[PDB]
Amino acid sequence: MGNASSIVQTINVTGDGNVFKPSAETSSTAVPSLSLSPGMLN
């Protein structure tokens, strides 16, 4: 990402205490596909 600064903030992208630990049980999807068949929807 990048570096920045603010007088008051909630999270620190460049700071300490963040976790980056990919796992199999976690994975990552958003919404690859949906079922919109003409037969199903009427």
Partner 1 sequence: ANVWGVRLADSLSSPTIETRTRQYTLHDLCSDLDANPGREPWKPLRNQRTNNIVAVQLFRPLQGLVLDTQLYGFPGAFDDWERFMREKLRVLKYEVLRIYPISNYSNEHVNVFVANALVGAFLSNQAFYDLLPLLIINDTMIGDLLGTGASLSQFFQSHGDVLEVAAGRKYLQMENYSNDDDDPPLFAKDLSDYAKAFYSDTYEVLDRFFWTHDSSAGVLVHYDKPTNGHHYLLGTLTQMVSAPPYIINATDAMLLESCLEQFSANVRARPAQPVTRLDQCYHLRWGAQYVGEDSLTYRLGVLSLLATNGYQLARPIPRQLTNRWLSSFVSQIMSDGVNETPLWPQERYVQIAYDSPSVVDGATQYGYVRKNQLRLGMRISALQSLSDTPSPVQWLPQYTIDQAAMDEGDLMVSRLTQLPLRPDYGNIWVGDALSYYVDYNRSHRVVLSSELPQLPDTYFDGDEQYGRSLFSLARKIGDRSLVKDTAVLKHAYQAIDPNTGKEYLRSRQSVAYFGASAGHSGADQPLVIEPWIQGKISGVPPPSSVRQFGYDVARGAIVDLARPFPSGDYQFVYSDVDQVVDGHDDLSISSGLVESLLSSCMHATAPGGSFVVKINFPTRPVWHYIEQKILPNITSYMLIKPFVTNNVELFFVAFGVHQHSSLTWTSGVYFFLVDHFYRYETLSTISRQLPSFGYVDDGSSVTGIETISIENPGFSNMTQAARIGISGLCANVGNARKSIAIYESHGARVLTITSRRSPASARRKSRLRYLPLIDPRSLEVQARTILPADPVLFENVSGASPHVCLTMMYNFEVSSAVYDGDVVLDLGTGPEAKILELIPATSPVTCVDIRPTAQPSGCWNVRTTFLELDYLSDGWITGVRGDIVTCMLSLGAAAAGKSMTFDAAFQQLIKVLSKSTANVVLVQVNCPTDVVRSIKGYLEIDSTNKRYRFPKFGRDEPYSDMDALEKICRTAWPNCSITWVPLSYDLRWTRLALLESTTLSSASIRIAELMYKYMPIMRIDIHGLPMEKRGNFIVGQNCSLVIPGFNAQDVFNCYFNSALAFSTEDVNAAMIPQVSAQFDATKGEWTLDMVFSDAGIYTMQALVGSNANPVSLGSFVVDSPDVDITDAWPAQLDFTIAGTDVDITVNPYYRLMTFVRIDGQWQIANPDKFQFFSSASGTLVMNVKLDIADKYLLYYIRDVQSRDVGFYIQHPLQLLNTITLPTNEDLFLSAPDMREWAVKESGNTICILNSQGFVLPQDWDVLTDTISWSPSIPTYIVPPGDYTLTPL
Chain contacts with partner 1 (rule: CB under 8 A) = 7-8, 10
What distance in Å separates the CA atoms of residue 21 and residue 42, rounded to the nearest whole number? 44
Closer to partner 1 by Cβ: residue 10 or 27: 10
Q: How far is the CB of 1 from partner 1 (least distance, A)?
A: 20
For residue 1, give the nearest of 29, 28, 24, 11 by alpha carbon: 11
State how far the Cα of 3 lies from the Cα of 15, in Å rounded to an integer.
Answer: 10
Q: Which is nearer to partner 1, 6 or 28 (CB)?
A: 6
Question: Shortest distance, CB of residue 7 to partner 1, whole angstroms?
Answer: 7
